[PDB]
Design a protein around this nucleic acid. Sequence first.
DNA 1: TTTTTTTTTTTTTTTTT
Length: 1046
Amino acid sequence: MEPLDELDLLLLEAVPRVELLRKKADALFPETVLSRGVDNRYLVLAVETSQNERGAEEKRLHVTASQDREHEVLCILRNGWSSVPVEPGDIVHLEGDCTSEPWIIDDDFGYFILYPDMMISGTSVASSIRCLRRAVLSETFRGSDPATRQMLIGTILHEVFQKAISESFAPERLQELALQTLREVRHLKEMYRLNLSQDEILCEVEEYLPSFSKWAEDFMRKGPSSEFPQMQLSLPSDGRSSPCNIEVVKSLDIEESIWSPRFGLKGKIAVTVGVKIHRDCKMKYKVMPLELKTGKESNSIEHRSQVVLYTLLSQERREDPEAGWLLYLKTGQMYPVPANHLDKRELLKLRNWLAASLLHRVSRAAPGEEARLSALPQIIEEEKTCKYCSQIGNCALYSRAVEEDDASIPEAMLSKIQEETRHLQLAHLKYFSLWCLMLTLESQSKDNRKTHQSIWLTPASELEESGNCVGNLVRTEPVSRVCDGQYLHNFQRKNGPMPATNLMAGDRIILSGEERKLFALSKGYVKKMNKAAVTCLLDRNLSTLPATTVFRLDREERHGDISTPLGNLSKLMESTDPSKRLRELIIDFREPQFIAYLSSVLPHDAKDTVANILKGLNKPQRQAMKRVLLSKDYTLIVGMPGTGKTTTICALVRILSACGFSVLLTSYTHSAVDNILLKLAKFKVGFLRLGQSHKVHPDIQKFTEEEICRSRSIASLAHLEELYNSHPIVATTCMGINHPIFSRKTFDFCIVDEASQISQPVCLGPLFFSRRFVLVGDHQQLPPLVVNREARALGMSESLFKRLERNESAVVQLTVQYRMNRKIMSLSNKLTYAGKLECGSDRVANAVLALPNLKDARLSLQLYADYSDSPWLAGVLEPDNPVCFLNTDKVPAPEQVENGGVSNVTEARLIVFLTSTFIKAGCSPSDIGVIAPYRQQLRIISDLLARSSVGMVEVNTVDKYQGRDKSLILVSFVRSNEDGTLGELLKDWRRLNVALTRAKHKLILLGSVSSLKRFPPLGTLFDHLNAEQLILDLPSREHESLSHIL
DNA sequence: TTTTTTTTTTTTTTTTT
Ligand SMILES: Nc1ncnc2c1ncn2[C@@H]1O[C@H](COP(=O)(O)OP(=O)(O)O)[C@@H](O)[C@H]1O
Ligand code: SF4
């Protein structure tokens, strides 16, 4: 902006800006409906301050409830509300009521709810009173508040007390209760984690019991109303002084899980009780929430505030209970906590700053320039609180690795920060900082940012026609118990028919209700589903209102994933000797060491068994076990397609076991880990499988911790612990590193399968618990999926396997392969694997598609088409033509772009035919895989398959094909456009590679050469395919053979 | 701005200074 003139013209002045705000709000909250009434959500447009009185702060907002931008309702935040950090484009809900007329909310009237759809937990809001930063770091680095002894006691006691209040507080019954709950595997596990004594906990717990009876005798006695405890209790309700008498009648509800779209709060009410307030001779019955605390009788603000928040959660279900109860089981002493407006306001005010802090994580610095990690709420000056924080580690850490001539932050702390982080180097800090950025950006991506509006705002019918909102349903079937919070429930619709679609039994589902007052209820998953009935497992027992009721079921989705990675990252930063080792190997790229073979690298006795195992393996394979055995640090086994990695890992494990090594065996997916286990079962090799037995493969479920427990009836810390030390081999998934076993066990070796598909910080997990490790992967196959552009561009898709692969000394390749026949191999050998793949045998090499009745198959088709149009059909069916590309150029085959994904019905129509034929030629549909680049194209191909009544063949994306193979693969490349649009997907060399490597015997490829050639991987394909004349161009859609398919 | 997706769930609290 130079000349006088630039300035003149650069003067603006409302609409395109309003539009960019609507874009902005949908990056954060996609598809917020906007509204009036109870569940309003207005969109902020403008934010200014003014001055009343003289030096008093007012905040002036301009908001709208629908898209027509003229419905601008003005709004003023006074007193404290004035400083709530709203910027334009934010989604707000005024629960200080109104909508009818927002106007003025201030100290005395109205609540302001910044980002309502984002429900923050009351405990977090309570935490923030003392330290916002502490609360935020808790919410994001969730593992760094490790379970303590008091916390266990506390849970144990909570559970007993709820058990009691349903039943009796009779001492013998209380004893019976505590005695029983002390044996529950959940608690056994935590006793195990903290290496405690079962009986020591029993005792510690037992001393509380008397106080349970003291309380019950005081408040639940049933007798004269004079003779209940007597306290002042000023409600809103008119009259609130002069004492009155309190009588707990019954517990109505325990562990009431609640979500509030209204205040953007979530919470779990320990106990809901029926209460009678006796008042002279009159009585008033109120259902109120009770909070239990096993701590010291502090009556602390935290504690009270928790109750105040519980009163709000409650409104979402029933009348505003106006006040609630704080217990303190230690001493039996119940306190009244009244939900004053000042408190409710003060807290929702604070809960705004928290909702803000958690949502504003990454900073532009220049609207559209590269990302930054936003600083957190600053470090408090109250050294009393800091002193024992738990989150201090990360606070000091996040500080150093994201901070700022200035500082000016309590010099008392500045030093402790350094004490905490001096073990670290500049690269370690940079590494940490960057992975948090990447992870954050991924986490915040629009895919993992969709809200619960569908659940509580649109009714069930409209949503059931897609995704998942099955339900306007009923139960009558008695709830079966299974264990703790897993109760079996049964559902069906009232009266007649009713459908199914995206409800694949085993999903994540949220059970809500007909009306808005019964939203949330219980979350859980699905067992099995007949299209008339449906059975799904939940945490809550739902008997309270039977038959009257109707229930909508919905799904879920990720993002909060980042907690395990952030855990791992943060762990890597800890100053322990393992964490140093991994820093050096991973961040500082320290060269891994190997030793020279010598006679006694293996225990003498092991040697015979090893040799026998070795003998059954090809050279590359044998060379891989040698590397592992000679390693001091790590080993990278490159498992190129069909080279037998499952066979190989099993062999390794068998060798390592022979040598008296303990080994933690991991992978990304259950099936991946299970496949290896199955082999190991065959070899009679013992191992313990952690993880939820329902996700475990069936033949493996006998080895599960969960299963062995129920089976052998394990109800003691010694018998559980005996189980844990039962096997030196332990198998779990990378994410399942949160098991208590890893608080106490370490391994000689960690093995990670699919090491190249797992996101780097996740893969990092199992490594903390093992001396040496082995990543098995292949970087030519798919990487960890990184949705977000900017992150992918910062390197987030680099697997740990790849990262570490620059040390060649540690890389051993698996090349002898047993899947593809000489011809098909040759393809990927020329395109990708630089001639490195060899055939397992002549069997594998020379194998061709099994088609026992080609003869009558060929005739039956010619009963509409011609013999002379042999070009394709003859070449296609020909078993001895294993690789074949079909050019959809000369017959128009246009794509259909539909809100993101692309399809091609012509191509779909075309391949469905080819499928029918191949089954009819004698090839079992079992042995058939269909692949397509685009998810959308899968639908279409699936449809036309039920249309032609052939549905056993599996249509799926390359991804859902990793590591699996079929006898025949057919690929619809679905791209076919004029000379423009050219998606990112086909540019990817790795997705292509996987497609050309799924087939054993016959590989058939289908797309428009014309537009496909402009994708480098495909261009290069077409070259090798032309050289061998394996592309065969098609007739027009008019020709004798095609016309009958269109 | 170009569409590819598995895991872990009691993920809300259990205390303490
Ligand atoms: N050293 C070997 N000798 C003979 N056959 C092998 C060898 N390694 C792998 N195979 C064969 O390769 C096939 C693939 O191995 P497997 O581990 O079952 O699945 P994948 O290799 O696809 O994980 C198996 O049927 C197995 O018989
Ligand atoms: S350590 Fe002190 S500052 Fe850092 S978070 Fe915990 S409380 Fe807030």
